[PDB]
């Protein structure tokens, strides 16, 4: 038994990829007939590789791939049980593993990170996190990037990257650090002193007054089904018609129906950052240039939505990232939180510090 990963090319159906990985047409039919009516298997996104576990005989035992809907990515994990295709449904299937990287830039940050196999999710989040302290494209030969992040493994196969837990960038001899601190939304990023990393202006407001965050950005395991789903933004539950505001100055690049996002507004900000405001009930008169705080629309349940909520999504260079401390203001910590933060960051700091003493990429 051994694994194979077949890269998804634009226009590929699940069948095309499985066929190209050498799987028999009969086997492909069985998979498409059984799950083709629960997820789009006819048009997969080419941002991944389909994983297939092939037994000694040469027949498939397990297939792993992501299906996409506007606002989410569902891990379709199938496995033969008694020779019958079933959805993997074990809370032991996925492991979330801490991963550490130390990269020394040769010509560019993004290229050196790409070479070290740092996933695009992580490269673009890193760029967003330090935006207020320095630009990532400004790193030169000799500069260094150290990362501690969650890596998601399904039956031993790395399928996705989770949150950055800690990051250190040494630029022109200056050390910049960011630590993830959490205590129903995710955490926030603070520097080594528990202070906000973001610039004075930029993203100074949440896009609305809301009841509660019904779903943060990130990978979540379904409590009963044990299936995995990436939420590509934050769902803020709020009453129908609640005003929605541009989180920062920018230019509106889209206003209208956007598939499963329903009524949506897209804003282009600086630094390749875009914000998306989805499921709106209505638009405002905002057009072209917008100011942070300007009303751009109103909460609804248009598109793929059960109840009223704003789906808020941040994209850096086209990649959806966790909006916290990137396209949202970071709340300042109280002296109490600063203490709890200092204690919680000691483990991550020890790891970054140990790799600092190494003058080349660790590999
Ligand atoms: Zn959503």
From Swiss-Prot:
Its main location: membrane. Keywords: Cell outer membrane, Cell wall biogenesis/degradation, Fimbrium biogenesis, Hydrolase, Membrane, Metal-binding, Metalloprotease, Protease, Zinc, Zymogen. Changing residue 311 to A: Altered colony morphology, increased sensitivity to H(2)O(2) and dramatically reduced peptidoglycan (PG) degradation. Altered colony morphology, increased sensitivity to H(2)O(2) and loss of peptidoglycan (PG) degradation. The keyword Protease applies. Induction: Expression is up-regulated in response to transient exposure to H(2)O(2). Likely to be synthesized as a proenzyme. The cleavage of the N-terminal domain is probably required for the activation of the enzyme. One of its GO terms (biological process) is proteolysis. GO terms for cellular component: cell outer membrane. InterPro entries: Cell_wall_metabolism_enzyme, Dup_hybrid_motif, NMB0315-like_N, Peptidase_M23. Disruption phenotype: Altered colony morphology, but not cell morphology. Decreased type IV pili expression. Deficiency in natural transformation. No sensitivity to cell wall targeting antibiotics. Susceptibility to killing by human polymorphonuclear leukocytes (PMNs). Increased sensitivity to PMN-produced cationic antimicrobial peptide LL-37. Increased sensitivity to reactive oxygen species (ROS), however, the survival of the bacterial cells is not rescued in PMNs defective in producing ROS. Survives as wild-type in PMNs deficient in production of reactive nitrogen species (RNS). Zn(2+) binds at residues 231, 235, 311. Its cofactor is Zn(2+). Peptidoglycan (PG) degradation activity is completely inhibited by zinc chelating EDTA and phenanthroline. It comes from the Bacteria. Monomer. This is DD-carboxypeptidase/endopeptidase Mpg. It comes from Neisseria gonorrhoeae (strain ATCC 700825 / FA 1090).
């Amino acid at each position: 038994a051994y694994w194979v990963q077949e890269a998804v090319q634009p226009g590929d159906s699940l069948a095309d990829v499985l066929a190209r990985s050498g799987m028999a047409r009969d086997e492909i039919a069985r998979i498409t007939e059984k799950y083709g009516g629960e997820a789009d298997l006819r048009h997969l996104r080419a941002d991944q590789s389909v994983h297939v576990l092939v037994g000694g005989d040469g027949s498939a035992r397990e297939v792993q791939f992501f299906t996409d809907e506007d606002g989410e990515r569902n891990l379709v994990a199938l496995e033969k049980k008694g020779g019958i295709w079933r959805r993997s449904a074990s809370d032991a299937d996925m492991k979330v593993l801490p991963t550490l990287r130390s990269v020394v830039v040769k010509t560019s940050a993004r290229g050196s990170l790409a070479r070290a196999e740092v996933p695009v999710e992580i490269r673009e989040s890193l760029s967003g996190i330090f935006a207020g302290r320095f630009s990532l494209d400004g790193l030169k030969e000799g500069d260094a990037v150290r990362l501690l992040y969650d890596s998601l493994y399904f039956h031993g196969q790395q399928v996705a990257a989770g949150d950055i837990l800690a990051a250190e960038v040494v630029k022109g001899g200056t050390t910049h650090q960011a630590f993830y601190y959490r205590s129903g939304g995710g955490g926030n990023y603070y520097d080594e002193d528990g202070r906000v990393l973001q610039e004075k202006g930029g993203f100074n407001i949440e896009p609305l007054v809301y009841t509660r965050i019904s779903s943060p950005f990130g990978y979540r395991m379904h409590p009963i089904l044990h299936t995995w789903r990436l939420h590509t933004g934050i769902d803020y539950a709020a009453p129908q018609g609640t005003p929605v505001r541009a989180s920062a100055d920018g230019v509106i690049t889209f206003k209208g129906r956007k598939g499963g996002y329903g009524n949506a507004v897209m804003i282009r900000h600086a630094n390749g950052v875009e914000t998306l405001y989805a499921h709106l009930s209505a638009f405002s008169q905002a057009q072209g240039n917008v100011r942070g705080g300007e009303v751009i629309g109103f909460v609804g349940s248009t598109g793929r939505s059960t109840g009223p909520h704003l789906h808020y999504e941040a994209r850096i260079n086209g990649q959806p990232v966790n909006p916290v401390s990137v396209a949202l203001p970071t709340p300042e910590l109280t002296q109490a939180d600063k203490a709890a933060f200092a204690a919680q960051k000691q483990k991550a700091d020890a790891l970054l510090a140990r790799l600092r003493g190494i003058p080349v990429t660790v590999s």
